[PDB]
Symmetry: D2
């Protein structure tokens, strides 16, 4: 909190975290004793911001019990009532938008120009579900012979959220917002690489007036996350991360019959037809590939450009990608920070390497970097890369890189690309730049993904649902649809007369 | 089909099945070669109705491929269009109500008095979802700055249903009805003990005008059901059965990220307050315990009666249970047939046995039986049993028996029973007989089950949703809610102007 | 009914009606005594099909009382139950599709090619609302401090429908379908020019199994219609006709605070941009102007064509309009029958006359006609007319003609036409033929009408709502929206504890 | 505004209004020149608070034009965007809750104990619809043969509200809240007796950030209100007042085909069964009759008590009514202020007078009053009256008094009272105090009113809809239902292929 207020004077390479990162029972837990720890880094400098001590069964359980208690109280409040508290929680995040954004940058690495949006996105989500709580309802149906039935929309109990690192504050908000609006209690575990901003949100909810313990936070990784999935008092698990893990999470959740939702990854296709408007199309390809160091799950990393315009398109886009400013993330003119960790950087580079080993032709970027500024010497920087000469069978076209690497591929006919676009086990997003009313919707209707952008890309409004198809997951975040994943319907049938018995 | 037309003259112990029970590609498959088989029995006589040859990977796959093809066509039809075919499929079942009902009895064992309802229930479900297909829709929202978004409600693909034996024709209908209304293709596997009536439904849909292959049927058990869960072209699994299995099904489904819904079992509580109306209450307890040989998942097998009325209640109910006619199921005055199999009978009896070994006091029934009629000598009959002197810790009060065995237990205060009622890992149904407006809803609101009957029991209207809480499963069957389990929403966001790019 | 069965051999100029046209209490009323009458004509021949005796207060009242009785019973049935009867009523209309269609032609005048669609449209509407009845519901909301509320969706009572003549059977169906699906009783008054097919529908509902008296029919005009609006036992009036009358109907309805819905007329604009596809655009203009002798309220009678394509468009469309076959309506190759009455014909011609007197330039049609066939000598025929050289101030561009008269006008820019298109007191429909995704929706969003077709026209699906804007009326027919105009919500709030009193 | 800030020291008989009461174009209009005026009074003292100059065509029109302009801008903002402004408008009313409440008392006359609730009710309504704006949407349906349709939920235009005096600030809020949430512009006319607090709300919206002119206010009466109904640029009229006027308003609205909603009066019945809980029942009768000097439209002024308990009920309730403190409204221990005007007081007394002249038996109250405090000597006070010995035919049982007068009547059987309860031309509200689950809902289902309270009364939550039945009006305020009265659906059908033309 004070660290958040210190931000106005904070700058790259200067900050250092010192608070405790575990939070339950309405306060930060000291987590005493040795307890193996992990270093969390400042992506732009490679500096160690602090250590993070992971939670074991003992801790986790307390977190849960804490939530459990609070739920009992919070679930008794009416929507109109849970609404008030939430509206305030937002108003607060609103008033600390910047400071929080700035801190978000230091641990995550994305540019503040982005970070700021990330947070507005966070408080809007809350303010949205808040206004949606008084709407929560069930039905009343008149049945044959005077009897009638009615459903009650009830909360699930204690909801566990397992977060990812590309949008720390935003994703946590996206899971708590609907969860609480519905009357549930929450316990979430931020990515060990980005444990700091999460707890902030938690404190804010308490500060807003939430019953002590409603929002808890446990730090840690695999071991921890597992404890959450196995804990018998968690009614729901909301996971966001890689497909491989999503698969494990779902399995463990089965042992208890837990409700589950998975927003896994993707290798989404962007389709460019010759009748489009190059500039907007260039922007799309661009916006669809390099936000947050290209570490965005919904990125159209597999760009299909209709052969006729391949040249002029590929020209302007290589220029534009080279014109991207890599450097201090806390700078407003910077357009790309460092990746999340060294391992990730090496992994992303390793991909570009094998790309050319498979025939790929690198038009720009794809190599380590070293900013002029001396303090960024140890940052995890690389230059945005644009591949050319790609084949549907190349590892880079098939695998989710999760780095700033764009694969451009030519195509000739509509029927052609559709079969190629949908030819993946993934199905998160997709896009299309064209001008013909029919082709637009038609292609939209035919792509097998959960989201399809038409003449734009990477927009993620709170008013609409968001989730995957196929192995990109199921369930939704944002939009009204979501409330059904954090509530259940009890059917109450009421006989107005006498029982019809066969005995 | 002809077997269905032969029914008017059919009678207990006379029939014998001879058709092939596997169905895909729009016809019955001969399933040649030895291929280990299983005997399906006529519960009322112990006779072997026929053998059933289970499907292996080869067969299953063909089933799926068949569905797969048909889906492509059926999913292209509009709701209003899929509606027409379905309305006819019902009209047909309607016109063969009896014959089908009669055959249902022979393999299942329940009395025709019940069987008939089971089928009306089947065609109503179809006729309901049919009228609901033209309603299937998504949203259109206006977004900031001229852009707008819209969701399309799309079918899942190929839906696999794994059925149970207590309501063969009804449950299959309950899974296909919504599935098809939504544009999906179906492949279901009836319980190996009751493979016959299922395929009938399948043929009817084809006869109604469904694209060849839309509804397929594969016979078999564990091995088979597994193949369905692992098959890469099945988008959804809809399971109904025991908790133990539900758990395995969910695990296998995870390997592919399949959509899943489980309508598992239960040990639901029936609450009787002293201010109720004994007769109706007696009927409830009765209706809540002995339909279909008491092999009903939603049965209030754990009856709590408020101490003051314990005597007079327990008196009239023991008399009534003894007054139940056990015999030929195809007889209209019969009120209980034989159980599904010998093993089940021995299992149900074994429970009563250990009950008294734990202190239970048998007031009636609980032993094998032997009807006067000579042809029913080998049937699987036992007499409806009513336990007395039960404790919350006795195995019979905790375990789902799935036989005609009622456990009566006394209670004193409201707060008392609630804690006791909800003290289970189950949460399917529950009931309450009282007269005070406040207690009714209040108790309703507090029970932790998916369904709560007030002054009645065992009613299951199509207009309302039905499913479990906790480990009784998740997802719903019937009611509007269900459509969300057989459809998904694709978000299509459309930019009306130019892209806002940070590059 | 028998007259309906006689149709297979019926032919233009041969038929003659002889049944009684008033219907209530579940049978046709003899309407004895002189009682001034009106001749109903066969538009294609000018022959008198029969006389029609109008209802006075006495009769009307009986109709109402009849409905009133039946409602009491019908409103007690559950949706699922009202559904069954309706599904049958359709199945019947389905099975007499042709014969009914044929008879529809004889009194109305439209070609059977159209008539047939009109009827399928009728039974689909019923079959649609039928499947929608089991869906009818209210809400259940949890309120602060334990209390809860719930709404019941209840029928209105006795609904009065006042029909128009351009689609006799279809419009009556469109009013009864939702009315009954909701539990209401209906009393409608067909247009005195087309009283015959209406009563047919009525009988069918009875034949389907509707409670005696639920659907009644009273013949007559102004006087009669008024009695309906003033009658104290009619809860709702559903009017379709001219604006002038809609206005009177609404006034009379006020004296009792009756629910009202008005589907008045219109002078809807069709917009053709230079980037469209001429053929489809020509078809649109065509389909938007000459169905049912151009006596369609939703016709885009004010066609705006972007200047560049004005010539080639105007050429092909004048040719096509001249290629329309006017003659025997009961002939399949006929594309236009005679108008509804002599007065209407003279009125439509009078408009074309004054058109040229104001500067209009007639490119074709616009004059009386006389088919070769001798029996059609006295029919009410005229040739489809296409005006050219029109001004926004000409009477023909401003007034609803309600005859086959198309006004083509040039335009230059988008902003231009929008201001011109929306510059009317009307607001029923509108259309736009263009190819640019943005312009399409954008223009759609900006037109001030209740319906907007994009690259087509005159389609009226049952799945979606239909009604006007401005002075074209309010309320909707078809689609789910409608149910809210035939039902009301009672709020039932239930206190679970004690009253909070300030006394 | 400053007057609002002066309130902390304000006291009965001290204040005096001096601001201008007309408001449009975002500021208070000086309304110069003589222009006949009307005195607005302080009910508790009879003092003249100020004069009110009514608006003529000239003024009104400017108001409208003002709204008209602002609408153009406000309607272009997205729900999420209109939401922000509204949330603030509330937060403001929230922060001035008291001062506003206090001022409300001075002109209206109700006690501050009530006034305070009135205002919380006002800001909640806004905060509710605000959170509901981002939810505003239409549908997307897939049609036969590739085509698809979609509806846009669009604002109406300029909405006119004609208010009543019993809840000045609350009712204005109840009309603006939904109106704006939907994108409309508003112009309302407060009751000439209570013109002051209205404009406050208006200013607040502007202060919140609403486009200049979106919320306007014109003072005046009949003449003025008429101008609103006739004005050609008002798309909707939302009226609240007497039945007689509601009827005139609807007639004038017809001349333009304006959308209309009427929340007229009522003579609602309260039913007390012998199995109830007297105390709560007494409170109900009480709360249902004497809030805001009994000048509440939803009051159960016609109390039916089951004969057996008539005595003990009637005893405790006469005592309680006598125990009501009449005096200074700005006092917290006061439970009833003075009525709205002298004429109203004389009218209410005149009713009690004729009551006894018809046989009524006055058990208490019913006469003028004169508080001890000297400053209240000229107030419009009378004592709460409780009639006894009433007949269904007495003028007092049939007419809406709109004063603190309770008519108690005995009854014997359920079927009896229902016929008697529903035997009225009114149908706004009704209540029932009983304990039997079946009777409760059953009676609820059978009463013919728009609202039915069960074991409580006068609760009016924002989460649920509120409106009348029969001649008590139509349309709803509060709850989700309302949004449909401030928005309309445009159907946009889009052809994906070629036109099917018959020419």
């Amino acid at each position: 909190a004070q660290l958040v207020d210190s931000m106005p004077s904070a700058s790259t390479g200067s900050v250092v975290v010192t608070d405790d990162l575990n939070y339950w029972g309405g306060r930060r837990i000291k987590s005493k004793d040795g307890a193996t720890t992990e270093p969390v880094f400042e992506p732009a400098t490679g500096r160690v911001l602090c250590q993070m001590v992971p939670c074991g069964a003992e801790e986790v359980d307390q977190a849960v019990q804490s939530a459990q208690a609070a739920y009992l109280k919070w679930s008794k409040m009416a929507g109109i009532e849970r609404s008030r508290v939430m509206l305030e929680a937002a108003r607060i995040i609103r008033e600390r938008r910047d400071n929080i954004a700035k801190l978000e940058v230091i641990n995550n690495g994305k540019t503040i120009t982005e970070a700021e949006y990330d947070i507005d996105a966070a408080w809007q989500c809350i303010e949205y579900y808040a206004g949606l709580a008084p709407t929560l309802s069930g039905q009343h149906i008149q049945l044959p012979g005077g009897a009638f039935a009615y459903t009650r929309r009830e909360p699930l109990g204690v909801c566990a959220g397992i977060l990812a690192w590309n949008y720390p504050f935003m994703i946590a908000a996206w899971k708590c917002a609907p969860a609480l609006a519905c009357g549930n209690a929450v316990v979430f575990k931020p990515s060990p690489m980005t444990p700091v901003t999460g707890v902030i949100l938690a404190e804010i909810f308490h500060e807003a007036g939430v019953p002590v313990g409603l929002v808890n936070v446990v730090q840690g990784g695999a071991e921890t996350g597992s404890l959450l999935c196995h804990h018998p008092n968690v009614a729901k698990v909301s996971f966001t991360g890689s497909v491989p893990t999503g698969k494990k999470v779902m399995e463990m959740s089965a042992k208890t019959v837990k409700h589950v939702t998975l927003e896994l990854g993707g290798k989404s296709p962007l389709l460019i037809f010759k009748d489009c408007e190059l500039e907007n199309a260039v922007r799309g390809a661009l916006m669809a590939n390099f936000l947050t160091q290209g570490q965005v799950c919904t990125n159209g990393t597999r760009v299909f450009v209709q052969r006729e315009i391949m040249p002029q398109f590929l020209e302007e886009v290589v220029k534009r990608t080279k014109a991207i400013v890599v450097g201090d993330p806390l700078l407003t003119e910077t357009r790309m920070g460092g990746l999340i960790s060294k391992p990730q950087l090496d992994k992303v580079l390793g991909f570009v390497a094998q790309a050319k080993k498979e025939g790929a032709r690198v038009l720009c970027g794809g190599e380590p970097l070293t900013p002029s500024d001396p303090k960024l010497k140890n940052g995890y920087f690389m230059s945005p890369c644009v591949l050319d000469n790609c084949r549907d069978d190349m590892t880079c076209v098939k695998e989710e890189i999760f780095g700033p690497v764009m694969s451009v591929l030519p195509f000739d006919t509509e029927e052609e690309v559709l079969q190629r676009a949908n030819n993946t086990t993934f199905g998160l997003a997709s896009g299309v730049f064209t001008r013909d009313i029919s082709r637009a919707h038609r292609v939209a209707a035919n792509l097998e993904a959960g989201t399809c952008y038409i003449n734009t890309y990477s927009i993620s409004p709170v008013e609409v649902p968001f989730g995957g198809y196929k192995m990109s997951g199921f369930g939704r975040e944002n939009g009204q649809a979501t409330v059904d994943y954090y509530s259940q319907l009890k059917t109450v049938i009421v006989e107005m007369g006498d029982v019809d018995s066969l005995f």
